[PDB]
Ligand binder design. Structure first.
Ligand SMILES: O=C(c1ccc(Nc2nc3ccccc3n3nnnc23)cc1)N1CCOCC1
Ligand SMILES: [Zn+2]
Length: 203
């Protein structure tokens, strides 16, 4: 029972979500190899994801975590990129989405940099790029990211099961790079906004 509601570009919600997406683009150490070369996006659509089952599942787990962490869920809004967006918005996050080869163990990874999430849209390392042109830097084909509500709780600061007494891991990666986060329970993230976009070729 997932439905998707389109937001008007005149909606404050559309504008705040776009701004978060645009303002967290950075340059990457791969020179654009995985996610492409761009400074900004063309946002084409932003849809609100509404699923009562997945939400109650999220808030139930949020309450648990909160009570184990001095009444502090440590809830963030973070980006996630994946080939399986469609599965996520209907079935939610689960152990099948655990990135076994990730630097912080077999969990689900999120990012403050939208452009880091962009690198995983066509798979790990950008895969073979867009299905139509096999171009990881394609300026034509439409991409999709998720902007997710994420419960971090007590997060282990790093410079499958979570670390003992901790509900998530914070990776603190470079001075301009923002944090990346890992959760080990699928119930600790809710896929709230689905964003459709293109990367833009710099002028
Ligand atoms: O295709 C994927 C996969 C991998 C990574 C992300 N998403 C992200 N990975 C990140 C890794 C490191 C740092 C940040 C990452 N990130 N930010 N946003 N999304 C990701 C999705 C699917 N998998 C294969 C099937 O089983 C599950 C794993
Ligand atoms: Zn393409």
């Amino acid at each position: 029972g997932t439905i998707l509601i389109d937001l008007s570009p005149d909606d404050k919600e559309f504008q705040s979500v776009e701004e978060e997406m645009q303002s967290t683009v950075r340059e990457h150490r791969d020179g654009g190899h995985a996610g492409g070369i761009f400074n900004r996006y063309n946002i084409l659509k932003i849809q609100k994801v509404c699923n009562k089952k997945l939400w109650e599942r999220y808030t139930h787990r949020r309450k648990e975590v909160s009570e184990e962490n001095h009444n502090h869920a440590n809830e963030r809004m973070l980006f996630h990129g994946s080939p399986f967006v469609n599965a996520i918005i209907h079935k939610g996050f689960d152990e099948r989405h655990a990135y076994i080869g990730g630097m912080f163990g077999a969990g689900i990874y999120f990012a403050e940099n939208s452009s880091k999430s962009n690198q995983y849209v066509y798979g790990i390392g950008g895969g073979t790029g867009c299905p139509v042109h096999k171009d990881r830097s394609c300026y034509i084909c439409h991409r999709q990211l998720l902007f997710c509500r994420v419960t971090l709780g007590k997060s282990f600061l790093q410079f499958a099961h979570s670390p003992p007494g901790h509900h998530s891991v914070t990776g603190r990666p470079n001075g301009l790079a923002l944090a990346e986060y890992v959760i080990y329970r699928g119930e600790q993230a809710y896929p709230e906004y689905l964003i459709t976009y293109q990367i833009m070729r710099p002028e």
